[PDB]
Write a protein that binds this DNA or RNA. Structure first.
Ligand SMILES: C/C(=C\[C@H](C)C(=O)C[C@H](O)CC1CC(=O)NC(=O)C1)[C@@H]1OC(=O)/C=C/CC/C=C\C=C\[C@@H]1C
Ligand SMILES: [K+]
Ligand SMILES: [K+]
Ligand SMILES: [K+]
Ligand SMILES: [K+]
Ligand SMILES: [K+]
Ligand SMILES: [K+]
Ligand SMILES: [Mg+2]
Ligand SMILES: [Mg+2]
Ligand SMILES: [Mg+2]
Ligand SMILES: [Mg+2]
Ligand SMILES: [Mg+2]
Ligand SMILES: [Mg+2]
Ligand SMILES: [Mg+2]
Ligand SMILES: [Mg+2]
Ligand SMILES: [Mg+2]
Ligand SMILES: [Mg+2]
Ligand SMILES: [Mg+2]
Ligand SMILES: [Mg+2]
Ligand SMILES: [Mg+2]
Ligand SMILES: [Mg+2]
Ligand SMILES: [Mg+2]
Ligand SMILES: [Mg+2]
Ligand SMILES: [Mg+2]
Ligand SMILES: [Mg+2]
Ligand SMILES: [Mg+2]
Ligand SMILES: [Mg+2]
Ligand SMILES: [Mg+2]
Ligand SMILES: [Mg+2]
Ligand SMILES: [Mg+2]
Ligand SMILES: [Mg+2]
Ligand SMILES: [Mg+2]
Ligand SMILES: [Mg+2]
Lengths: 159, 205, 294, 169
RNA sequence: GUCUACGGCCAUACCACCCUGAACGCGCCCGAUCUCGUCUGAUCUCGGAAGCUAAGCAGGGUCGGGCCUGGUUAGUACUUGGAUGGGAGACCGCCUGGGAAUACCGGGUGCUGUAGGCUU
RNA sequence: AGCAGAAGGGCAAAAGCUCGCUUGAUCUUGAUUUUCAGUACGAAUACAGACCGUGAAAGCGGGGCCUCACGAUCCUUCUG
RNA sequence: AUAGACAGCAGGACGGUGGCCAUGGAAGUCGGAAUCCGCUAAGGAGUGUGUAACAACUCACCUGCCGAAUCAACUAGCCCU
RNA sequence: AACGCAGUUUUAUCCGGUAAAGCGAAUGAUUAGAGGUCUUGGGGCCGAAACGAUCUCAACCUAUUCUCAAACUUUAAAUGGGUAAGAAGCCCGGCUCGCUGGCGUGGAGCCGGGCGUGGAAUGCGAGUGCCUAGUGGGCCACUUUUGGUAAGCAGAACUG
């Protein structure tokens, strides 16, 4: 039976990367977090206050509260056979913006913008993404050069 | 005494080296890993013969010692007491354990150190002999005898490298003439065409 | 050959350099973090700080706020701008610090149209003053002093610039404890002593002190003051006129930009082909050198 | 010819009296060092506890002071006069400094006092060139360039030039 | 072309040794009356402007170390899923997909934001 | 190196050392995390309201750099 | 290996020299290192038997008869121990 | 004439330190030879009255070299974990605040209007409450995996 220690097994998890120790770069604190945005939780061992528990490291949540140094995040946590929406407070050193949400939010603007130009021009711009279709037909020019003949090589005992 | 080697033939446990967590390990049977003329210059012993393991098993320190003695003894008979150089390329670092059962049961069964073995991979070289080309037949025959001290299948392979270096024999002489291989005792030093030009100056001075 | 080379290849492999401005010894990131970082529940509200940097021959006063791409300067005042307002010499004295602090305060409030609304202390007493906001008017500009790597002992010139901005009308939290009038013995602050330092009287007493005993050292210590025909007697009124000039027209007039043809003063980076050729030349000369010698 | 900023000078002179015990001797030793320089010295404690030397940890066993400027120059002259303006070649460190010892302090033109006693002291001279303070300033702290560094030979020559001293092998 | 102040990223920026540096700056530098602090005006604080780029700093150099990046290593090692595959076993091969890391060999050696300055 | 201790993580104008001042180891209501049944205890995180310390100030601090160092009902005892 | 192999049937297997050290004995043949040269078809610083040392036999090497393939090592299938 | 969902992929993005690898990279372990040789010791010799000269062996340093790590690591997979893929969205105008504030600043809330190409694939109708029995000795197989010489042995992970 293992211990119930709050930081058991986080030897490598909360360690700093190689040659990345020391002062926390200040753009970390300059980020702006507002209610409703999506943040990636990643505990950093340099700051021991406002640590997320190890079960929330590598998880993504939604900010619901903002305080002087920390944010309240709603994170989905699977508890045996149920998923709970856990409300955790973590200092902003241990979070960062989820680029996935940022990329999607950009596409919504682009879709909405592209729709306005589709009305003033007739043309139908494709908005929905499509899975990689089967490759269409094409020709392959030999350009005079005959394809190189490949043969399996004899076995060589390299020890 | 020792259990039969069949009880520790397979790499069944994680590596368990002699460390601060594993105290009281008896010293391995094999202590001398290099024998013959270790000092012979790189160019004196170009021919190299290797005994290569064909199984993923454990070789005991006693087994390594017996083969070393067996190969050494024959090479002295066939080439001379200084006509070669033998290096054992396996060091027994894996500690095997024994749960001493002296007339309780399996309670607290974690054993005590018994000896050391060398976990060998398929294709890992077990021992190497470098000598003159005229003594190739003896090096195969000497390594053939040492094969009978080990469990499992072993293969004898005459290396195309020069001696105990990592450079091909057919091009070793050319690289030495072009100063890309400076003889450094037993082996050679590779001269990269980089680094301060002063080093190039000395070499060509 | 006895000592293990500490500066060996593994030493450099594992070496983590500090931040560039820490390596340069310019910024204290421990204090920087506490200075420029805003509370997250204030979002994009800027946190303005007053940068005061006393140099060998100049005083730099700036108002800045932090952004990810870098700090933004909204107002900068320099001590070398004081000759326009009257002060020709002593540009790095406590009196010049007060003027540079006053100049930055008026220059900023003038850019924000707050100068007419907030005047500060027009007449200097050296006492404790704090500008308070007026109801129905925009609130007083609030910034925090950034002393950088300076030691904040009493009488530090960064507090001189702080006094100038405070009297200029900028709301900066502070206490009189670090002004020159503060007495560490009685734990009492003397406003009159502060005013003498602000008006440059300690420099005035110094110049009088030299002229009495050693005229030769007086010329050595104040040669440029003698050149600018400024005397201990006229020092106070010189700064009184300077404060009037600053409060009158604090606007900065950028130096007329004059185009000049591009000129290169430093060597550019050598090309790889040149570097390869240089090594090839060196080797060829080396072989000939042995050829002629042998 | 030579840059005026490459001139060697006395950065400081460090005077140390290691009495080896706390009590009457250290207090009197401080008075010797105080009246030799005019500066109140400071007491150095023992980092270890050595039974052989009879010293315990955190026990004041030595008295030392640092002197600079003209006062350090003139005290140095008294020291070399006692040493007859001659030093062994090995007295010079590889960092361009050198030092010597004085067996009796009254050899330095100091009147002996029965209620004080006679004392020996250690003299260390730290040389330097203008600009060495960049390694000591808080802001924009910099490390001196290789050429500025004073080599052992240039410390020995400076001693021969200034005090026309003698270097013994 | 470049500096100063404040920076963001935090070595492509570090480290060693060297060469060069107009202008302005940054410096070193001179001094201790005042402020302030020291065993020591060295540091720190303050008041300056005789000298110097010697140093710092800046640019450049070096078959330089490091770092960054690419190749090779190598479809190798390892691996998802599959078989009434082989083998006494140890282990191995194949099918289905994924796919590294040294040594070794090339290339690079800070970018940039705000404000102010300098370069007929 | 050190940071009381086991170890692991973290830390260099500091979290180490030395010095100065202090009592944020104080008063109070909730929320949350950890074990989890998602109960309790313990411990912890982020706030809020008082009253304070420190610093020029930003700010930091309601115990120890973080991960352990502890205890229901009934009863007794003390305080308002 | 048709410029004659392999097998078989027969001859030579020499001089320096009993090469050096060592050993009581060591003359190719107890041991350790050197393992070279006129002489041809070849003969060695010897593959073995043998002697206290010799001697002697014998082997590689080469020739006569012969007239088409043959020799050595290794490897892995089934089978066998 | 669809409300929504998923033991699944795709797209985007984040997480990780196992496999492997590495040790001429840190920590720990470990074989050999080579070159330096300042100092440090020994052997030994000249000198021998004194240093002194000189050689060797070690130690020590430098560049190489053999072999390793569950409780080492610069690197670093495969499989895997989280989140997002819109109408609770977007866009425009206005208002409230005792919070915040140089600034109708920042933030939040509220009100009105406008806009459907329902903004990846595939499949499926979902949501929600009450009462509730039995069970709470398990065992086996692939692959991973601990102790043990091993066990039709003891103990885990995953799916069946
Ligand atoms: C252990 C005891 C105090 C505990 C804090 C406590 O609360 C005990 C509790 O009341 C026990 C009850 C609780 C329960 O709900 N009902 C039961 O009736 C018993 C006492 O410790 C001693 O002072 C002496 C200790 C020495 C040993 C001898 C006697 C213990 C006396 C003290 C009763
Ligand atoms: K466990
Ligand atoms: K445990
Ligand atoms: K310079
Ligand atoms: K406060
Ligand atoms: K290692
Ligand atoms: K039950
Ligand atoms: Mg704490
Ligand atoms: Mg096991
Ligand atoms: Mg075998
Ligand atoms: Mg500070
Ligand atoms: Mg005393
Ligand atoms: Mg000075
Ligand atoms: Mg120069
Ligand atoms: Mg390089
Ligand atoms: Mg690469
Ligand atoms: Mg610790
Ligand atoms: Mg501090
Ligand atoms: Mg507990
Ligand atoms: Mg509070
Ligand atoms: Mg605390
Ligand atoms: Mg067969
Ligand atoms: Mg059979
Ligand atoms: Mg792990
Ligand atoms: Mg491994
Ligand atoms: Mg690796
Ligand atoms: Mg039920
Ligand atoms: Mg039930
Ligand atoms: Mg039961
Ligand atoms: Mg059970
Ligand atoms: Mg069973
Ligand atoms: Mg079982
Ligand atoms: Mg059972």
């Amino acid at each position: 039976t293992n211990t119930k220690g709050k930081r058991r097994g986080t030897r490598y998890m909360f360690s700093r990367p190689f040659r990345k120790h020391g002062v926390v770069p200040l753009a970390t604190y300059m980020r702006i977090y507002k209610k409703g945005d999506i943040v990636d939780i990643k505990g950093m061992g340099t700051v021991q206050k406002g640590m997320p528990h190890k079960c929330y490291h590598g998880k993504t949540g939604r900010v619901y509260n903002v305080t002087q140094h920390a944010v309240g995040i709603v994170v989905n946590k699977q508890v045996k056979g149920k998923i709970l929406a856990k409300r955790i407070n973590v200092r902003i050193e241990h979070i960062k913006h989820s680029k996935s949400r940022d990329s999607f939010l950009k596409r919504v603007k682009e879709n909405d913008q592209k729709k306005k130009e589709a009305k003033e021009k007739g043309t139908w711009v494709q908005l929905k993404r499509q899975p990689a279709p089967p490759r269409e037909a094409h020709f392959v020019r030999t350009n005079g050069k005959e394809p190189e003949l490949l043969e399996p090589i004899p076995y060589e005992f390299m020890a | 005494g020792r259990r039969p080697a069949r009880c520790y033939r397979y790499c069944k446990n994680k590596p368990y080296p002699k460390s601060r967590f594993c105290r009281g390990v008896p010293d391995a049977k094999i202590r001398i890993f290099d024998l013959g003329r270790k000092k012979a210059k790189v160019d004196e012993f170009p021919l190299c013969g290797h005994m290569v393991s064909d199984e993923y098993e454990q070789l005991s320190s006693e087994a390594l010692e017996a083969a070393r003695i067996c190969a050494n003894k024959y090479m002295v008979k066939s080439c001379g007491k200084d006509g070669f150089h033998i290096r054992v390329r396996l060091h027994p670092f894996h500690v095997i354990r024994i749960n001493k059962m002296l007339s309780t049961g399996m309670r607290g069964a974690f054993g005590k150190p018994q000896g050391t073995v060398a976990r060998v991979h398929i294709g890992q070289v077990i021992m190497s002999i470098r000598t003159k080309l005229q003594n190739k037949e003896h090096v195969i025959e000497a390594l053939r005898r040492a094969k009978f001290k080990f469990p499992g299948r072993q293969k004898i392979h005459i290396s195309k490298k020069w001696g105990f270096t990592k450079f091909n024999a057919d091009e070793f002489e050319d690289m030495v003439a072009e100063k890309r291989l400076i003889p450094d005792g037993c082996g050679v030093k590779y001269i990269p065409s980089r680094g301060p030009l002063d080093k190039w100056r000395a070499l060509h001075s | 050959g006895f000592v293990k080379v500490v500066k060996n290849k593994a030493y450099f492999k594992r070496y983590q350099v500090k931040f560039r401005r820490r390596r340069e010894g310019k910024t204290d990131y421990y204090a920087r973090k506490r200075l420029v970082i805003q509370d997250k529940n204030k979002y994009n509200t800027p946190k303005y700080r007053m940068i005061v940097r006393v140099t060998n021959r100049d005083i730099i006063c700036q108002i800045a706020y932090a952004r990810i791409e870098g700090d933004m300067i909204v107002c900068a005042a320099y001590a070398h701008e004081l000759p326009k307002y009257g002060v020709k010499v002593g540009l790095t004295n406590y009196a010049a610090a007060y003027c540079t602090g006053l100049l930055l305060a008026r220059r900023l409030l003038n850019r924000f149209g707050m100068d007419k609304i907030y005047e500060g202390q027009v007449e200097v007493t050296g006492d404790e003053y704090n500008v308070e906001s007026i109801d129905g008017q925009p609130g007083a500009f609030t910034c925090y002093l950034d002393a950088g790597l300076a030691r904040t002992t009493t009488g530090n010139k960064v507090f001189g610039a702080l006094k100038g901005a405070v009297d200029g009308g900028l709301s900066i939290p502070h206490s009189t404890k670090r002004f020159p009038g503060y007495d560490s013995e009685s734990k009492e602050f003397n406003a009159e002593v502060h005013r003498k330092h602000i008006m440059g009287q300690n420099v005035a007493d110094y110049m009088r002190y030299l002229m009495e005993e050693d005229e030769d050292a007086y010329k050595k210590q104040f040669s440029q003051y003698i050149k600018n025909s400024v005397t201990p007697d006229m020092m106070e009124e010189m700064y009184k006129k300077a404060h009037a000039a600053i409060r009158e027209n604090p606007v900065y007039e950028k130096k007329p930009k004059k185009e000049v043809k591009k000129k290169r003063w430093n060597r550019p980076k050598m090309s790889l082909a040149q570097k390869k050729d240089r090594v090839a030349q060196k080797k060829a000369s080396f072989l000939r050198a042995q050829e002629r010698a042998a | 010819k030579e840059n005026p900023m490459r001139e060697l000078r006395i950065r400081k002179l460090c005077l140390n009296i290691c009495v080896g015990e706390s009590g009457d001797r250290l207090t009197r030793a401080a008075k010797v060092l105080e009246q030799l320089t005019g500066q109140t010295p400071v007491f150095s404690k023992a980092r270890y506890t050595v039974r052989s030397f009879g010293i315990r940890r955190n026990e004041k066993i030595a008295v030392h002071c640092t002197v600079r400027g003209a006062k350090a120059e003139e005290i140095l002259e008294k020291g070399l006069k006692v040493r007859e303006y001659e030093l062994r070649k090995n007295n010079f460190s590889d960092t361009g400094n050198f030092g010597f010892g004085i067996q009796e302090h009254i050899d330095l033109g100091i009147k002996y006092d029965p209620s004080i006693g006679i004392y020996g002291l250690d003299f260390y001279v730290v040389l330097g060139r203008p600009g060495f303070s960049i390694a000591d300033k808080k802001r924009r702290t910099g490390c001196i360039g290789a050429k500025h560094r004073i080599s052992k030979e240039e410390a020995m020559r400076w001693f021969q030039q200034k005090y026309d001293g003698i270097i013994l092998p």
